[PDB]
Design a protein around this ligand. Structure first.
Ligand SMILES: CC(=O)OCC[N+](C)(C)C
Ligand SMILES: CC(=O)OCC[N+](C)(C)C
Lengths: 427, 406, 394, 414, 380
């Protein structure tokens, strides 16, 4: 027969185990619960609703004197498995979730040992509220957090702690998220830079409350920006070059304003797509959003300047006066600065004089139109030489500032500890 | 065994969680209701539903749950599963979905005097009537109605929760700074709490919590307002292009298309409530109508520009009103074979003279067009500036009241 | 209360919740069912499902749950969980994407005479056919059919509490106005059990849609583009942008047609008013584009190939412009050089004749443009009235 | 109430975990009928058919029999289904985890042991959509009912019998039935199907399938999608009457019509499913008119190149001019002062003659472009008309089959 | 029957579902685990989640659940609810959106010798990394890792039923083709319990995408606009619609690129080949826009301002295309003649600029034609 049945019966039914009572010999004592996290897969991070979905394993560990047995008396049984509904478990819950999933997804068996040690490792899928810092999108890094608290007991009855490992006979706390190389999958968009674990005690709260303590696991994950650079930033940059390129179009063809407005519309479409991809928070304007606003403002300036050039090109000496100052500053000084490229017989004689006068007036009109055309061309050249470097410098500066948004070397300010798995705190 | 087990066995020997803790018949159980907000998740305007993560600070007195701590090794208090004790059915009567009860079902805290305090946590999706008049530069007055679903005033008496010391009653939503994550879109201006009684039925009594939250409109300003301001600037610009260049209509209708696209893509943000029109939608409609009128007037200007003596005759009143009076105001004022050869040259001169007169009248038509579009430019600039300034001034003046009415 | 504890222990000691609360099996349970509408959550037009928040008030008398108050300290009313007592199996017949019956199972009131007052909440997502004939000024008659499933009229009988559903605490939806509401009771003989009738109560709500949102977000831009459709005839042909304006109006109407399809169900019972308006203005834009192409082709008729017909000139130069008055329409070796002068003079004369003929063609095109402008303005002003005022008059 | 005593007698020693076989090798006959109250929707995106049906299940349980003379003439009781054995008839064809019925209504138990269970249910059953003739298509959707636990050696699924004959169709009650408004139920056959790959000791050996040959009503799609698409796609025919000058905007019109067709393609992609077995009929029409529009844009480019070329850039060969001017139009309807003055006048005359001679070839190229425009207009009109007519004719001829099963002469109607 | 009720009452009278079905605690339960894929519901590319309808066949032997049929009227097989017997806790390790374990809890077959055959249905929404390198002609290697959670190898052991998952009743998805499928069994040492191994079985399905839908909806319009890109060069400058056509093509390609972005996950593991093709054709469209604005500016070069370079002239003209009042009236006539001569030479220089524009257009068209023909050759 199986001795496990006899042992389980003796532990639960014969000893009258109560799963609603804390496992202490006196009521004034405390129960130490060791908590640990094992991230197996970072499923997603939806910025639109500020949700971090993660597949984790929750490692609980506590002593229970009611589950102790003499191993040699029960035919050398060194371990047991019991369902959670038969034994007392600490109800550690995720406080900062977005849905009603406070507990773990699956209630797997607990493992008990003859010394009373109980280890419970259920899997879970948690959707915590991660506030999205969209300031340096898409080169951003997010400081997400998972907050676990024991709301079923106060700090005088249950004390949460971090699980302790042993190396070389010395105990050190596990102050990080455990990543098992044989059960972890890279997300492909988020890279785990830091993963600290902290035990927080709030001194302004009382020990007899359920808000006095909590254990928090942080995920400082940076976004790999290759996808967004290839698919969003590159077409935005390429299309925006056509805006400054619209100045090179001659005013004769009616495709100047068409090109500039089309560039503006493409930038607006990209802006709307970016707004669809990002949350509606008002903490800060995104980096790509600021870039798009800057580009749209500059393209609007280009459209206004193209309208001015078109107005100057189609001016007529019968409707406007070519002033001396405008002439001397738009075809003498500025083009040189910018290095631009450079009786029947009596009736017949009276008729000939009249037609010669008409041809003279037509030629003077043509010369005035040519002067206005040169004025338009030099305004186009000046606007190109004053707008194209502004576009290039703005794009380069914005993308360099975004690219230099490295997450900090230490996870907490003022704390010299790096919270790395390769450097134990007290070992 | 542990005396906690003995005390639990003694307390729940004949306890029935289906019975009110009225020690005498006719008594009312005074239930204190408070709320602790930990996170205001989102305010979904499309379905008019606000979801929050809250703690329900409940407290009552059960005479059956009394014991002497001196006879049980100094046990001043116990933590009992919430299903084992009687609880009032304090549910969210304002819930949009079918989520009345709490979610977490934490343990209750029973003290030796009989005082029971229960603080369950829940994600509550309540329904909020959205005042959409000043969207998005607006504030919402969203309520959460908490009362016992079953027990009326003759059986329970709702009150307000006590503070940490317990010497006074707190009449507001308690916010714990160590656990509150401030929402990135809403700022809590006022969080009062009050008890409401309805006339014609004394059996009704509830405790409601108000969240007078003001939206931060930076997102909508950046992604909707500034692009439309740029589009309206373009619309004003279309009365500065020459009619000779064939890009006036392209600019005007491209501006109209942009405004239409922004209005259509805003439909997933504005709620479908039909009580009023949001001020951003009013601004978009104002810009759309202005751009449509700019298209119509650009069509009129182009029609005036291409006229000729062969098609139209200049009216007396049009000339008198557009060449004489307006340009002073608008500063647009303008500044044998010899016999056959002689006959041919005279015919050439006659044709040139006729062409000269024809283009003189054509230039008069073009000048009338130029004066017309300059007048339209000034009028549209003034109208657009005044309308935009007035709309945004009214939007900015919308602030929540200095004191809530609770 | 110890008295209430004794009472509850005594009531459920030998109580079986499987069995109907009747003294004799031939009798029938008399149940008073009333519907209390609390909030009209949503009206999904595409899925034809209406979600409502209701309180299904039900009353009946259970003889097994009566007591003498003087034997229990004067208690007259208590409350019990609904799972401990017999409940009617009230089922929503026209359920669609929801629960058929009550699932929350809140407590119920129970007085000393055995009368039970149970008011459980319910989110009824019920199917009701949506008539899109007069959308968005439409009026929807949505129904909610409630009846006992497994019991017939001779076993358990229902009766409406009042002829109209309770809307005293009804929250205003802000999108619909409750024009009318009523509840009727039927005796239906089903093919499954034709021997006995099954009773049901059908609550219908006549909801009138507030059209301001759809008017502002849909109808007004469509009206603007319909106005701009006929405006292309006032645009001169020489600008070369008539096609731009017409095709832009066409693209806008295509996008709005894409918008309308996602707003209404794909049901084919009746054509929608807004769908008929969209088809009408689409045909209007197609006709305006075709006429614009005709006018542009007329404006560029080469005089060297296309001679002016007599009837065209007579119609469009002599009579029609004279009729209309709203617009300002017009109603040695030296002889080699002399031969060259003669040649250039003859070339000038031929060019003048050709330009005069081209001017005649352009004038004909302009007259056609004005006629079509007047006709299309009149059509745009009468067609919108004929579509909308038929419903707006009511 | 005698019902209390009767029910306490029946369920006193009754357990719901045991199939009610009287002896060994006794097979429980389970009869099914389906009552389609309302065909709710056919969501193409997830290929799910949502129907509100009442499924009637009848079997015999010998443990639930009693003598009416000992219980005051009671011959019918209602027992909640959770307290009784059930044949576990589920929908094996579901799109989600919903196998069982939604409500679990009471079970009518007669004194002879007959069981009559009629629970309401909302079933979401998979059926692949034949997109080949969208939107004039007809869908052959079906619901498969199998015993989730028992096999053919334990239960025997059958169709119910009314008057000695099998039902073999989806019953429709005249009371409480609403037409869908988009789908019309042409045929509703039902038969018991055997899967002969398995043996009769397997659970999935026997099935009962209720078919639904529903035909879509295409008036909505015609008015809202097909007709605007046809009217817009007929505008590319008009590009041949626009002038080939700087104005007229032939390429603008043709390209914008192509863009409108792309908008319609995006619209239709939100209607048809994502399945890749076949191209939808309206999708084929859209691809055809897109290819026609691309060819018309190419032809606009060609005629713009031909019309706008000059003798100073291209040489007008006599062969091409003859071919496009005599053959195609035949078929289609279409003293120092004196000396200086003389020299100046001669130069003026020579320059004028050269300018007028150079413009003659421009007019010839214009005429060539006009002739090509006319011929390509007729070709494009014929091609577009033939394509539109053929596509919508083969859509119109997508008749629902006369019989529910092509090889079966039976009609399967009441 | 009375025999079956008596048998079920006798089997579970002193049965404890907590304890493993082993005669001795040192032994291990041998469990035969097989998978039966019923229908692939959908593959969500953006979320990298694949939901499948499966039957998780499980077989083991329970010593405590055996009986002699001769004592119970000859019954050899009964069916019991799963909740009444010990059940292995098979957990989907890579679960992403559903339940880790089985939740339906259907009945199971039970033989008189103790063999238990349990076939519970389940829907597994499992995370599998989606390789978008060859989209939409790609294949996805999506896995489903099933293993016993709380018991190690020496306590409960599993073994696959067969080397391949069962697909006898698999219904055609209409979007994927099941190229290959196989299951492997592993011994994994986790950090939580490094002293003992935990067993698991991973079923991988090689699904080849059917590309007809994406070819019709995405690839064909993109090819149409890519072909329209090259027609810009053949379009004459004097039409004034060159930039209109180029801009329309560029905007259409941008819209389709955005659609493709919405169609694929945002993971940056590998750039899709369709994304590379879209980026390269957008680069080509931008380059053609640059060249066409250069040619437009060339066509409108005023000859009174820009002088024709000699090298441009030779390389684009000679080589590549080969591969009282009487005297006042007389003075006015002379002035007219000389002005006509000046206009003629200015028009000649302008025509030279136009000829250069035409030959630049022709060589760009030839380059596009070469690109097209080498692309069609590489397709073959
Ligand atoms: C009698 C039974 O169980 O079915 C109820 C059928 N209905 C809803 C038509 C009365
Ligand atoms: C031991 C325990 O309960 O957890 C098992 C974890 N696993 C499946 C990675 C071995």
């Amino acid at each position: 027969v199986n001795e496990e049945e006899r042992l389980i019966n003796d532990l639960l039914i014969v000893n009258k185990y109560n799963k609603h009572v804390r496992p202490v010999k006196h009521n004034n004592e405390v129960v130490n619960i060791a908590l640990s996290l094992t991230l197996s897969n970072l499923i997603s991070l939806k910025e639109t609703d500020e949700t971090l979905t993660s597949n984790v394993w929750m490692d609980h560990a506590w002593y229970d004197h009611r589950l102790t047995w003499n191993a040699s008396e029960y035919s050398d049984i060194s371990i047991l498995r019991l369902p959670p509904e038969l034994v007392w478990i600490p109800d550690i819950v995720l406080q900062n979730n977005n849905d009603g999933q406070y507990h773990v997804a699956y209630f797997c068996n607990v493992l008990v040992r003859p010394n009373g040690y109980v280890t419970w490792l259920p899997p879970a899928i948690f959707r915590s509220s991660c506030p999205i810092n969209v300031l340096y999108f898409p080169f951003d890094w997010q400081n997400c957090s998972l907050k676990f608290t024991a709301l079923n007991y106060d700090a005088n009855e249950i004390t949460m702690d971090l699980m302790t490992d042993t190396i070389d006979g010395k105990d050190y706390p596990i102050e990080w998220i455990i990543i098992d190389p044989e059960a972890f999958t890279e997300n492909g968009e988020w890279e785990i830079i830091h993963k600290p674990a902290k035990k927080n005690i709030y001194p302004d709260k009382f020990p007899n409350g359920t808000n006095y303590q909590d254990v928090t696991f942080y995920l400082i994950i940076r976004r790999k920006p290759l996808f967004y650079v290839i698919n969003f930033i590159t077409p935005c940059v390429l299309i925006s070059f056509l805006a400054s390129l619209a100045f090179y179009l001659p005013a004769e063809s009616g495709e100047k304003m068409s090109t500039a407005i089309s560039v503006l519309l493409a930038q607006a479409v990209f802006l709307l797509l970016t707004s669809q991809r990002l949350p509606e928070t008002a903490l800060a304007v995104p980096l790509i959003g600021k870039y798009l606003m800057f580009i749209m403002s500059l393209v609007t300036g280009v459209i206004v300047n193209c309208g001015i050039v078109l107005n100057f090109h189609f001016r007529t000496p019968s409707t406007h006066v070519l002033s001396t100052r405008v002439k001397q500053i738009f075809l003498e000084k500025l083009p040189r600065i910018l290095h631009m490229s450079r009786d029947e017989i009596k009736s017949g004689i009276d008729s000939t004089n009249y037609i010669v006068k008409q041809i003279k007036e037509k030629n003077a009109y043509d010369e005035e139109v040519g002067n206005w055309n040169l004025v338009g061309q030099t305004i186009d050249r000046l606007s190109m030489f004053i707008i194209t470097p502004v576009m290039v410098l703005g794009t380069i500066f914005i993308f360099v500032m975004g690219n230099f948004n490295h997450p900090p070397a230490k996870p907490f300010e003022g704390d010299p500890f790096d919270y790395s798995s390769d450097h134990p705190r007290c070992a | 065994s542990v005396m906690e087990d003995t005390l639990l066995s003694v307390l729940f020997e004949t306890y029935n969680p289906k019975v009110r803790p009225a020690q005498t018949v006719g008594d009312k159980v005074t239930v204190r209701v408070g709320l602790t907000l930990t996170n205001l998740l989102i305010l979904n305007e499309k379905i008019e539903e606000m979801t929050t993560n809250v703690f329900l600070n409940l407290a009552w007195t059960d005479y059956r749950l009394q014991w002497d701590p001196a006879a049980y090794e100094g046990i001043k208090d116990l933590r009992i599963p919430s299903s084992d004790v009687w609880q009032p059915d304090i549910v969210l009567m304002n819930n949009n979905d079918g989520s009345f009860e709490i979610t977490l079902h934490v343990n209750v805290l029973v003290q030796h005097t009989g005082a029971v305090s229960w603080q369950p946590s829940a994600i509550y999706r309540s329904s909020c009537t959205i005042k959409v008049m000043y969207f998005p530069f607006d504030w919402q007055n969203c309520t959460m109605v908490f009362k016992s679903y079953t027990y009326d005033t003759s059986e329970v008496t709702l009150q307000h929760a006590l503070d940490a010391k317990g010497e006074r009653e707190v009449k507001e939503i308690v916010i714990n700074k160590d656990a509150f994550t401030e929402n990135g879109q809403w700022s809590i201006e006022h969080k009062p709490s009050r008890k409401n009684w309805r006339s014609d039925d004394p059996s009704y009594e509830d405790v409601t919590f108000y969240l007078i939250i003001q939206r931060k409109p930076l997102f909508y300003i950046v992604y909707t307002i500034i692009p439309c301001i740029l589009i309206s600037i373009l619309a004003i610009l279309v009365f500065y292009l020459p009619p000779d260049a064939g890009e006036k209509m392209s600019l005007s209708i491209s501006a109209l298309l942009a405004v239409t696209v922004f209005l259509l893509l805003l439909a997933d943000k504005v709620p479908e409530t039909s009580l009023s029109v949001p001020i951003i939608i009013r601004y978009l409609m104002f810009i759309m109508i202005l751009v449509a009128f700019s298209v119509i007037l650009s069509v009129v200007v182009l029609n005036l520009h291409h006229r000729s003596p062969n098609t139209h005759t200049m009216p007396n009143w049009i000339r008198q009103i557009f060449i004489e009076t307006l340009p002073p105001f608008l500063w647009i004022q303008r500044p044998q074979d010899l016999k056959e050869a002689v006959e041919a040259i005279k015919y050439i001169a006659e044709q040139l003279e006729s062409a000269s007169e024809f283009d003189d009248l054509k230039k008069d038509w073009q000048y009338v067009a130029m004066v017309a579009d300059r007048l339209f430019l000034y009028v549209f600039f003034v109208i657009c500036s005044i309308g935009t300034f007035s709309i945004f001034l009214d939007a900015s003046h919308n602030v929540p009241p200095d004191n809530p009415f609770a | 209360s110890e008295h209430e504890t004794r009472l509850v222990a005594n009531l459920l000691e030998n109580y079986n919740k499987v069995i109907r609360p009747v003294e004799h099996h031939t009798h029938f349970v008399d149940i008073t069912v009333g519907l209390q509408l609390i909030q009209l959550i949503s009206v999904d037009e595409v899925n034809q499902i209406v979600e409502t928040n209701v309180r299904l008030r039900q009353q009946w008398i259970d003889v097994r749950l009566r007591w003498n108050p003087a034997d229990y300290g004067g208690i007259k009313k208590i409350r019990l969980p609904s799972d401990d007592v017999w409940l009617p199996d009230l089922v929503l017949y026209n359920n669609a994407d929801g629960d058929f019956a009550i699932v929350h199972m809140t407590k119920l009131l129970l007085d000393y005479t055995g009368k039970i007052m149970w008011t459980p909440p319910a989110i009824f997502k019920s199917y009701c056919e949506i008539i899109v004939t007069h959308f968005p000024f439409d009026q929807q008659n949505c129904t909610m059919k409630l009846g006992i499933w497994t019991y017939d009229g001779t076993k358990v009988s229902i009766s409406p509490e009042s002829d109209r559903p309770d809307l005293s605490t009804f929250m205003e939806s802000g999108e619909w106005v409750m024009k009318d509401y009523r509840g009727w009771k039927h005796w239906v003989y089903y093919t499954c059990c034709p021997d006995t009738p099954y009773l049901d109560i059908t609550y219908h709500f006549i909801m009138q849609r507030i059209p301001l949102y759809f008017v502002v977000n849909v109808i007004i831009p469509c009206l603007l583009f319909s106005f701009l459709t006929g405006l292309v005839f006032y645009l001169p042909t020489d600008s070369g942008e008539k096609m731009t304006l017409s095709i832009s109006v066409l693209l806008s109407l295509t996008v709005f047609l894409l918008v309308i399809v996602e707003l209404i169900p794909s049901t084919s019972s009746a054509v929608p008013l807004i769908g008929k308006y969209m088809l009408f203005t689409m045909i209007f834009v197609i006709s305006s584009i075709i006429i614009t192409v005709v006018v542009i082709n007329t404006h560029h008729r080469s005089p060297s190939t296309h001679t002016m017909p007599q009837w065209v000139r007579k119609i469009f130069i002599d009579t029609i412009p004279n009729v209309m008055f709203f617009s300002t329409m017009k109603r040695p070796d030296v002889k080699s050089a002399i031969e060259g002068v003669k040649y250039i003079a003859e070339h000038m004369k031929s060019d003048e004749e050709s330009s005069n003929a081209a001017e005649e063609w352009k004038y004909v095109a302009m007259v056609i443009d004005h006629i079509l402008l007047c006709v299309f303005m009149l059509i745009c002003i009468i067609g919108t009235v004929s579509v909308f005022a038929g419903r707006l008059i009511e | 109430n005698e019902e209390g005593r009767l029910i306490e007698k029946l369920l006193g020693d009754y357990d719901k975990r045991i199939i009610p076989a009287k002896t060994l090798d006794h097979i429980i006959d389970v009869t099914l009928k389906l009552t389609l109250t309302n065909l709710i929707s056919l969501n193409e995106k997830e290929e799910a058919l949502t129907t509100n049906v009442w499924i009637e299940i009848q079997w015999n349980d010998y443990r639930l029999s009693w003598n009416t003379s000992e219980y005051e003439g009671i011959d019918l009781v209602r027992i909640p289904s959770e307290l009784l054995w059930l044949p576990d008839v589920v929908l094996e064809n579901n799109v989600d985890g919903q196998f069982e019925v939604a409500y679990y209504a009471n079970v009518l138990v007669y004194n002879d042991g007959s069981m009559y269970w009629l629970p309401p249910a909302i079933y979401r059953s998979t059926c692949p959509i034949a997109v080949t003739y969208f939107p004039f298509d007809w869908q052959n959707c079906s619901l498969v009912f199998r015993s989730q636990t028992y096999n053919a050696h334990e239960v025997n699924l059958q169709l119910s019998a009314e008057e000695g004959e099998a039902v073999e169709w989806i019953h429709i009650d005249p009371e409480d039935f609403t037409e869908n408004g988009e789908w019309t139920i042409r045929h509703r056959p039902a038969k018991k199907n055997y899967n002969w790959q398995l043996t009769k000791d397997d659970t999935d050996f026997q099935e009962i399938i209720f078919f639904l040959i529903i035909q879509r009503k295409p008036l909505f799609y015609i008015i809202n999608i097909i007709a605007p698409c046809v009217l817009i796609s007929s505008l590319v025919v008009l590009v041949y009457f626009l002038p080939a000058q700087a104005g007229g905007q032939k390429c603008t019109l043709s390209i914008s019509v192509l863009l409108a067709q792309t908008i319609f393609l995006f619209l239709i992609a939100q209607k048809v499913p994502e399945t890749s077995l076949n191209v939808p009929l309206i999708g084929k029409y859209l691809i055809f008119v897109m290819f026609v529009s691309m060819l018309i844009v190419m032809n606009c480019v060609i005629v713009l190149n031909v019309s706008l070329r000059t003798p100073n850039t291209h040489s007008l060969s006599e062969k091409i001019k003859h071919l496009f001017l005599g053959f195609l139009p035949k078929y289609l309807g279409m003293a120092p002062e004196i000396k200086s003055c003389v020299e100046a006048c001669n130069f003026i005359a020579k320059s004028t003659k050269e300018q007028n001679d150079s413009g003659s070839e421009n007019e010839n190229w214009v005429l060539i472009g006009k002739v090509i425009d006319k011929a390509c207009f007729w070709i494009a009109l014929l091609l577009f008309s033939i394509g539109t007519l053929a596509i919508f004719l083969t859509g119109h001829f997508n008749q629902v089959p006369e019989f529910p099963f092509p090889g079966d002469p039976r009609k399967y109607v009441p």
